[PDB]
């Protein structure tokens, strides 16, 4: 990529980070990221991916903005209640950073369509609300070896893990195999979403060390963070 003079000034505070530099900012400009789910986590993650300069964002979600969403989905507003979340989010994100390209996809995609869509991106964010879509994304990401930055939140608890699909690394099924409406506190989505954005930037630019091979769990009631190692499960149906 080539940054304009105006972009160099906009992204100054990132450019001057030692091991990030112009090359890191250019890496972001040249990146293509797929964000799946434009609810709480997706609004939080996308806002900082956009501000940070990630050049191409695809926004995927089938749902519309509802009054109850507005407690935590800060890209959406009372004026956009009833609109597809991807459109409401796109309009907000383009104001956050007019230099990037935002593609809204208002659809519920099947596996064949997801395979194509995943393969066309550098990195995928899982900001969805259910294990069915999350398993779908993990399967597609695993097959194409496209990193998945996975965030989840409910009540007062959040989690993040990055799946890079390197040999010997666990996938989402290695975790999901361990188990089988409710409230959520607004800023929890901000914490997890922002962590997702951070991990995505780190992966795109090759900056720092990704949060792979561990679950980072945030317990908001006591402001405690626990890192627990995640091992590959030998017979997991996806990567076993």
């Amino acid at each position: 990529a080539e940054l304009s003079d105006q972009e160099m000034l906009r992204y100054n505070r990132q450019i001057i980070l030692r091991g990030f530099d112009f090359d890191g900012q250019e890496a972001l400009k040249d990146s293509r990221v797929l964000i799946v789910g434009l609810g709480g986590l997706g609004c939080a993650a996308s806002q900082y991916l956009a501000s940070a300069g990630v050049g191409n964002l695809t926004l995927l979600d089938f749902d519309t903005v509802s009054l109850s969403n507005l407690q935590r989905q800060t890209l959406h507003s009372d004026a956009t209640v009833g609109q597809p979340k991807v459109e409401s989010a796109r309009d907000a994100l383009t104001r956050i950073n007019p230099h990037i390209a935002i593609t809204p996809v208002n659809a519920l995609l099947d596996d064949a369509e997801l395979a194509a869509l995943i393969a066309e991106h550098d990195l995928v964010l899982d900001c969805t609300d259910n294990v069915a879509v999350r398993n779908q994304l993990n399967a597609g990401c695993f097959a194409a070896k496209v990193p998945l930055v996975s965030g989840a939140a409910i009540r007062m608890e959040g989690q993040i893990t990055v799946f890079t699909y390197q040999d010997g690394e666990p996938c989402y099924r290695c975790l999901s195999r361990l188990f089988g409406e409710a409230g959520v506190m607004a800023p929890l989505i901000g914490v997890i979403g922002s962590l997702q954005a951070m991990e995505a930037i780190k992966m795109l630019a090759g900056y720092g060390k990704p949060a792979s091979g561990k679950i980072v769990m945030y317990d908001a009631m006591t402001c405690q963070f626990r890192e627990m190692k995640l091992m590959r499960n030998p017979g997991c149906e996806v990567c076993g």
């Binding site: 009540r155 361990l178 769990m217 317990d219 009631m221 627990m228 995640l230």
Partner: protein, 81 residues
Amino acid sequence: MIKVLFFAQVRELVGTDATEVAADFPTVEALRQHMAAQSDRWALALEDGKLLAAVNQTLVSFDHPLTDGDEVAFFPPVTGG
């Protein structure tokens, strides 16, 4: 002793952040079933399928063995969301 830690909703449902137990639990499953049967409330908090467990900071399956000195952390999975 085995140190057993509870986080998030598990902790909020059972009323304690930590308790030391005798080392008479062969696996995480024995420890869980024992604790789950104390009350309906305990059974809800530690409901199979609605629970994760870490032993010495590593996520494990419920068939994992326990040993005196081990730290066991019980907490909920999240798909929020």
